[PDB]
Amino acid sequence: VKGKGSIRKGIHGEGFGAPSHAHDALIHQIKQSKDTMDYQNITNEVAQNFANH
């Protein structure tokens, strides 16, 4: 992909990271849902932030 480093474009998808890198669920939610949050879903990261605080 031009101007995207080592990120590759596959079939049906542009790709969001370098090959063999872990896909992030929060960024997936950000891309798919721009500003829509049906509810405050408590993931592992949110619970960890709560525990840290």
Partner: protein, 442 residues
């Protein structure tokens, strides 16, 4: 002059502490009891170093359910509610309501048009509204004295209201098919011309402390700038639309004109920068043009030429006739064309005619009957395009009446043009948008 763009804006990135909010934001109530919030505005404001970032305008603190009430009364009983919509410019609201009712009736008010009263008083309330708006905006910016002058010069217009209806603000003057002809006298127009002559001087007095002031220019220039695209997206009309560059005046529109405006000769002004300075200048020039329109109307109801002697070309002035006192006869056009209707109205009332007494009884007990249908009628009010969309089911009460107010759209666009500005800039912007919460909340 080097680039300082990175110092200007700060984005956010997921899970980036340096890109996030590294501070507790100042969440303040720009609440109703604030000098710059007008009466009922409760604006939840997020400040970061006195920079407005997030807006949450809470409105409805002056919502009185006026449309439901209007739907619950006969047509004439709801009309004074319009007086309480945009209580700075009163007769424009009545004019819009009466235009809607007349359109539903399929007729026109010839007695109002041939006397030029509606155009004249529309321009007078235009002067009232712009005087109040400019004075209050200057007071918000910091100029304290200018508010004392516009209020004295808008006391004379309040007296002009009081001389035709007996009220200073809520006239309830315009009626769907009736004009109180006896309320208008020639002695009133001469005082209006006197007021215009002195209003020139008072407007110049306000002119020379604000227009060329360096502080005023640095406070208003390049503040709240927007182009025609935003001006269309947010439904901006009136002075704001003329500042964004668009040529939109309902009085001068071929298919949308009303009440003698199409057959006068006046100018309208458009800005070329779309900021607060343009709006201020446009309001001053609109006041001047309103003076010009009033003068033209008075000329149209005036009798200039006289009878001269056959020899020596010497005028023969009357001695006992009323025309000797003044050249203004506010009934010469109406009596010239609609002589039959003029004669009947001046001879028969509800004290010596059976039909007229029956009409009076029905009118004041049940109201007039309006044939079923839908109408939408808009008017160039001093604050923008003010409209009424109303549907009637054939009874003496409106089935639905919806009020289109431009102050609501201006308040809606205010957060768009206020983000990134200082608190003082936000106060100045609230001043520049001529918003009244009686019209917004209704």
């Amino acid at each position: 002059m080097n680039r300082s763009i990175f110092q200007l804006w700060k984005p956010e990135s997921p899970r980036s502490n340096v890109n996030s909010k590294q501070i507790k934001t100042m969440n303040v109530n720009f609440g109703p009891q604030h000098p710059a919030a007008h009466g009922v505005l409760r604006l939840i404001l997020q400040l970061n170093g006195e920079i407005a970032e997030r807006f949450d305008p809470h409105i409805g603190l002056l919502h009185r359910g006026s449309e439901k009430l209007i739907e619950d009364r006969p047509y004439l009983q709801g009309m004074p509610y319009f007086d309480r919509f945009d209580y700075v410019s009163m007769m424009v609201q009545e004019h819009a309501y009466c235009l809607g009712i007349e359109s539903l009736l399929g007729t026109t008010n010839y007695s109002a048009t041939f006397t030029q009263i509606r155009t004249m008083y529309d321009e007078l309330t235009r002067i009232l509204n712009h005087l109040l708006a400019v004075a209050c905006h200057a007071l918000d910016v910091g100029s304290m004295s200018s508010v004392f002058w516009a209020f004295e010069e808008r006391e004379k217009l309040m007296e002009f209201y009081e001389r035709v209806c007996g009220a200073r603000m809520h006239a309830a003057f315009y009626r769907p098919n009736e004009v109180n002809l006896n309320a208008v006298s020639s002695f009133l127009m001469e005082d209006i011309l006197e007021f215009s002559r002195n209003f020139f001087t008072t407007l110049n007095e306000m002119h020379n402390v604000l227009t060329y002031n360096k502080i005023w220019k640095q406070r208003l220039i390049n503040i709240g700038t927007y182009s025609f695209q935003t001006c269309l997206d947010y439904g901006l009309t009136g002075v704001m639309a003329r500042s964004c560059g668009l040529k939109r005046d309902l009085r001068l529109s071929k298919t949308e004109t009303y009440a003698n405006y199409y057959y006068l000769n006046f100018r309208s002004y458009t800005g070329q920068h779309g900021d607060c300075y343009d709006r201020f200048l446009i309001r001053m020039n609109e006041m001047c043009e309103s003076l010009n329109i009033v003068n033209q109307s008075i000329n149209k109801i005036s009798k200039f030429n006289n009878i001269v002697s056959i020899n020596t070309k010497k005028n023969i002035l009357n001695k006992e006739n009323f025309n000797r006192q003044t050249t203004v006869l506010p009934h010469l056009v109406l009596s010239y064309l609609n002589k039959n209707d003029y004669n009947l109205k001046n001879t028969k009332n509800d004290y010596n005619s059976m039909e007229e007494l029956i009409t009076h009884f029905k009118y004041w007990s049940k109201g007039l009957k309006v044939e079923s249908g839908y109408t939408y009628q808009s008017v160039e009010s001093p604050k923008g395009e003010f409209g009424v969309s109303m549907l009637s089911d054939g009874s003496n009460k409106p089935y639905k009446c919806k009020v289109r107010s431009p102050a609501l759209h201006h308040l809606q666009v205010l957060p768009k043009i206020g983000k990134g500005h200082f608190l003082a800039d936000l106060v100045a912007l609230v001043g520049t948008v001529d918003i009244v919460f009686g019209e917004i909340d209704r």
